[PDB]
Amino acid sequence: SLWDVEFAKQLATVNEQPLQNGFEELIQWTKEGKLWEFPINNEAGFDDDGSEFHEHIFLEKHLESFPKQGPIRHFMELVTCGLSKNPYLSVKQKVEHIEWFRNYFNEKKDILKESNIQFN
Amino acid sequence: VDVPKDLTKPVVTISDEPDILYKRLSVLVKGHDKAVLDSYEYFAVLAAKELGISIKVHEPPRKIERFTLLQSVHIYKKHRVQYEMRTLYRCLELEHLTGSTADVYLEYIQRNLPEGVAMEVTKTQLEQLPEHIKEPIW
Amino acid sequence: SLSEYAFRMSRLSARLFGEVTRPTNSKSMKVVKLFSELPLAKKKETYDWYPNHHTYAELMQTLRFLGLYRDEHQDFMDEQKRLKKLRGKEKPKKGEGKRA
Amino acid sequence: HYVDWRMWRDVKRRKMAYEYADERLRINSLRKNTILPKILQDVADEEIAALPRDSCPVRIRNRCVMTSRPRGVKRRWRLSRIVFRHLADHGQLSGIQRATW
Amino acid sequence: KNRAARVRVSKGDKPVTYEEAHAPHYIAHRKGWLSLHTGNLDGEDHAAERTVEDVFLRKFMWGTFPGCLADQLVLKRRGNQLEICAVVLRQLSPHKYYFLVGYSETLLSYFYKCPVRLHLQTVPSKVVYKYL
Amino acid sequence: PPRRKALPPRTEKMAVDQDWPSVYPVAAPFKPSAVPLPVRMGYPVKKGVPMAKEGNLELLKIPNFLHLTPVAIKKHCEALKDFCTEWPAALDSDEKCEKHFPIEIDSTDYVSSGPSVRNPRARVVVLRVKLSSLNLDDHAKKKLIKLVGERYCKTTDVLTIKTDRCPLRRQNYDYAVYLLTVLYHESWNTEEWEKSK
């Protein structure tokens, strides 16, 4: 409750003293998150939704709507291979590119029918 | 006389998982001052000797990046001013240490690293064959 | 150029390491190249090239009006503008066409 | 509050190039292959041409972030040559000195 | 003749400090750099960002402490920490110094999202290396 | 009233026998009022001497190792000794280390300065394994070499795999292990089209 929170603040106040040395200031900064947590990891605080290597790389599971044969399949194989090799993109946006291609091909199915190609 | 009576040592907990084994750690420090690198090398060597870590220190060749710019603001292409940036390298390789010892040593040296000095630490972790690769099931 | 055994072994290696299975041409490989790297526009250097001059100017302007930042250049401009007004040269207002 | 209108236009071009960037990438992927049908490629050519002019990435110029100078700019520091020399001579740039050898 | 960051001779009553009396060709020979960071190193990045931050900090400190700074500023970066060292005068009251130091440290820390610590060394007057 | 007078430096109050590590606990800018050392720096003028420590900007522009005195280093290492374990005694030599751990993993951590610590170069994972350690017969050995291509050095008999596609280092490590597993299994596996060799 609010009273309990204020009671905890009072307990913190009576246990609080001004900083006595540089080490204490560094400890306070580390606890507050202002200072980094040595040793340096270069990836602390960055998690790509907990995704794994198979989710990042193997994107063929997202081509179920796409036909498995034809020039469209060949083009999507190139796109998925490029997305898999891309290290600067997350799984969400990699799927978004595939979704855009699926929507674009769905809109342009009539042109594909003219070129003797069937999509979905 | 006004010394603390009791000191609360930091709590160290021993987990049930095996520690990560590191064969070799290559710590390369880049800087612009050779004396600063020498002072940091002496600090690192003394810390390693106190902790009982085998350490070898060598000096990789320096790199100098030079470029030229116009000396004036107008119609004076002939006259140039040349600038340079000197990067001095010092590599300290520490071998036969555990993960806990490596973590403490890295944290100590990184916090004591002076400003304007870059550090790159290369790990060499020893691992066994995975369970799937133990025998040819296929 | 290469035997059938060599060709199939190379194709198997490409499948294992993630390369394109089909024998594409150089033009078609650009599709893989485009999606294997961030676009130049999407790169941080491109859009985050200039510092936010709106922030770096309004923040200092607010501090100066709050009495916590002294700008010699702004003081020089204000003093010169005041002297020009005293001399007689004042900025014509919008819609006040001297030539019109 | 930018240096000049030329810098302001460049900022707008960069902002509009950061936007529509993925759409240009997706459309240009269709245009830059021979596998897809030529009719679809031509439609992609029409779409990318109909895209806004400022979204084109080749309209972005690396100007100085201090004096808006379109040329004589070092890309590493994003500064014009005159500003870079002024800071280097004053000593405000770390690890930069006169080159003598 | 060159006139880049050089204090030319005068009647002889002009006081100069060590930093401003030494020409730029004496950098790394007789005087060091006023800012230290890892941006201008082989393989490192963000050199432009550090330069912009340093320029803004020097202008911010100059305007925040009018008639106080005696020499230039020494800027140091260690990981996430930023250290600003200045040599100031003693004309102002200590209350004004402490008020500005607390305000400047807090404002810069929130603006640059990094812990900024300001250190001041007061001198009776501007140190004169020589008279040009 | 006269202007406020600065107190004499505390170096006068300091004694010859003092706990200098306590005086300078952490890294701090040089302070002549706190450092009892008459150190002069600066190029002397004609018939002159180097500038005194008071007001010497050159001394302030030096990263000081006052907090890293040998006494302080020994005391710090003694306290931190409780945090370190012991390397196994059986792994005395690199030959024994290779025998017990055929797989070696290499990764690099980068220490920089600035608000951001992200670095794309920290995602690279290198896996080295000698094919002799792997249980490979003639068919598996030859097929594995052909599959990996230039990734295997015959002179050292070491297969090196570099993974950087995965955004995270852990994901790259998992992908590297997975690649080694499938390479081993497929090398042992025999295909009908291999009869056309």
Add this chain to the structure above:
Amino acid sequence: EEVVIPKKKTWDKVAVLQALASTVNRDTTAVPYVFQDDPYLMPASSLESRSFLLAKKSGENVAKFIINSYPKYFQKDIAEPHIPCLMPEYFEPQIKDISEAALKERIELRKVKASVDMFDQLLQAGTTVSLETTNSLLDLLCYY
């Protein structure tokens, strides 16, 4: 042959800093760490010591007031990992709709005058108010 792998020791992120702090001892000649280490800036008496701390706290309050009054000048994240504390502070009732959820938001924001007026408006409107929300409002009013 068998190799004995030692167990992995674990410690807090500040354990090393605490150990280094324990190494050094209190110094007598030094002034309190909160103050500067300059002869002119170091306090002389207890009254000066209190005044200098109050002045420094006053500067921090002024800086915080500027940040809160003008958040837009500091909404630019450049530090990784993110540092929530070094961010502009917002204490405003963003949800302007007259509803229980927004009333609870004002209770969390501890806006006593806004919450009670909104509660009266909600009661006049006739929409039901939860017992927990009413109790939370009473706790806020009783403390303030």
